[PDB]
Amino acid sequence: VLSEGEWQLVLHVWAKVEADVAGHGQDIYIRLFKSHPETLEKFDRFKHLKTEAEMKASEDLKKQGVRVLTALGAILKKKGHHEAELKPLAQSHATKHKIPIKYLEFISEAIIHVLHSRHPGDFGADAQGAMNKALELFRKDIAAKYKELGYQG
Numbered sequence: 401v402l403s404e405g406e407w408q409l410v411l412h413v414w415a416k417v418e419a420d421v422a423g424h425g426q427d428i429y430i431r432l433f434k435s436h437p438e439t440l441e442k443f444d445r446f447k448h449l450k451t452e453a454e455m456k457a458s459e460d461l462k463k464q465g466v467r468v469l470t471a472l473g474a475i476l477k478k479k480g481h482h483e484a485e486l487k488p489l490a491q492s493h494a495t496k497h498k499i500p501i502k503y504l505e506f507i508s509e510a511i512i513h514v515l516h517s518r519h520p521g522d523f524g525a526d527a528q529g530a531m532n533k534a535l536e537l538f539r540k541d542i543a544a545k546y547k548e549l550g551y552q553g
């Protein structure tokens with residue numbers, strides 16, 4: 401369980417992401433696909449992209465990144481009271497997309513890396529620890545829903 405102070409560290413960096421969610425999403429996807437290329441294979445619409453240049457130029461990838469970060473932002477804004485928000489996401493990611501918890505760990509890593517790079521003013525050590533705790537909680541709760549849904553993750 402995060403403290404209110406921890407949630408505020410999470411929300412204060414998220415406020416900066418929201419200056420330009422699209423640009424943040426592009427950086428996060430590029431980082432994910434570069435660091436863990438296997439994750440790109442899960443994307444029917446994007447697995448053909450060969451280079452960072454192609455990734456940057458993809459309007460559909462940009463739009464997907466906006467969807468991801470906005471869905472995650474809504475979850476973070478619930479400050480742990482995210483049962484309703486997690487249900488459709490867990491179901492689609494377990495059953496349609498088939499995304500293991502390991503890959504959620506990878507995207508969490510990419511999120512942290514991009515925030516660390518872009519936002520040293522709001523992503524010092526305490527803020528990074530708070531964001532890690534929030535993402536760990538997210539993954540814990542997704543993992544529990546995965547198991548309810550019959551997916552080992």
Ligand code: HEM
Pocket residue numbers: 439440442443444445446464467468469471472488489492493497499503504507
């Ligand atoms: C922060 C964690 C993530 C969030 C909040 C998130 C959110 C979303 C949302 C909102 C959608 C569209 C609605 C849906 O189908 O549920 C989506 C689609 C999708 N997600 Fe995720 N996602 C996350 C992580 C991942 C990861 C790590 C992968 C694969 C490695 C993945 C694979 C996909 C795929 C393949 C789609 C369909 C994309 C398309 O329309 O072409 N997701 N995700």
Ligand SMILES: [Xe]
Pocket residue numbers: 425426428429464465466468469
């Ligand atoms: Xe993203």
Ligand SMILES: [Xe]
Pocket residue numbers: 489490493542
């Ligand atoms: Xe997810």
Ligand SMILES: [Xe]
Pocket residue numbers: 504505507508535538539
């Ligand atoms: Xe995550």
Ligand SMILES: [Xe]
Pocket residue numbers: 475476480482534535537538
């Ligand atoms: Xe969360």
